[model samples]
Each structure stands twice: as C-alpha cells, then as structure tokens.
Target: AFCNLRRCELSCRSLGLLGKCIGEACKCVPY
Candidate 1:
C-alpha cells in the first residue's frame, strides 16, 4: 500500500525478509 520504504523494510526485517517497493506496494522477499 503506497510507498513507505523505511516502514516496509523494517516490517519485513522483523520477519527476516527483504522488503522492496514494486509499483505502489511493498513486497517481501527472501534474501
């Protein structure tokens, strides 16, 4: 939702994943 890189990144990091902004959404990926 939207593009909050800092928020998304931290959120995903909590789950041991990488967060990226694609288009207008946050995507969590294994890194």
Candidate 2:
C-alpha cells in the first residue's frame, strides 16, 4: 500500500491529535 501523508493527517485528526508524515508513517502529536 502506498503510504500517503494526506490520509495520515486525516487519521490523526480523528484521534484529536496532530499528524506529521515521515518516511511513510504518521507521527501523532499530542497537545
């Protein structure tokens, strides 16, 4: 599967966290 940053961002948003894309992975940031 193609790791896309767009989807990562949306996924993180759903969890109420900020998302950052790095090397085909999503980094979830908590505030």
Candidate 3:
C-alpha cells in the first residue's frame, strides 16, 4: 500500500486528474 501510494503520487504529479483516476482504480485492487 505504501509503495503504491508513493508511485501513485508520482503518477498523479505527472498525469493530474488522470493519475487520480488510476489511483481510484488501484484502490479497487486487493492490495
């Protein structure tokens, strides 16, 4: 979860809302 959050932060920084969309998708994953 920690690693994913860090990676998601980076992805968000680059992609903006799109990254957040991906983050939401990630949350659906079972860790």
Top-scoring candidate (TM-score): 1
RMSD for each of the candidates: 2.2, 2.8, 8.0
Residue 21, candidate 3: alpha-carbon lDDT: 30
User: How many clashes in each structure?
Assistant: 0, 0, 0
**In model 3, where is the ten-residue run with the lowest total lDDT?**
22-31
Pairs with steric clashes in candidate 3: none
lDDT of 1 at 27: 82
lDDT of 3 by residue, 1-31 (tens): 3235656556655654332335234322311
**Model 1 per-residue lDDT at 7:** 89
- Write down the TM-score for model 3: 0.35
Say what the RMSD of model 3 is. Answer: 8.0
Clash number for model 2? 0
Runs in model 3 lying further than 4 Å from the true structure: 1-3, 16-31
Q: What TM-score does each of the candidates earn?
A: 0.74, 0.55, 0.35
Candidate number that wins on lDDT, 1 or 2: 1
- Using TM-score as the yardstick, the better of models 1 and 2 is 1
> What lDDT does the true structure give each of the candidates?
0.87, 0.75, 0.43
Ranking by TM-score: 1, 2, 3
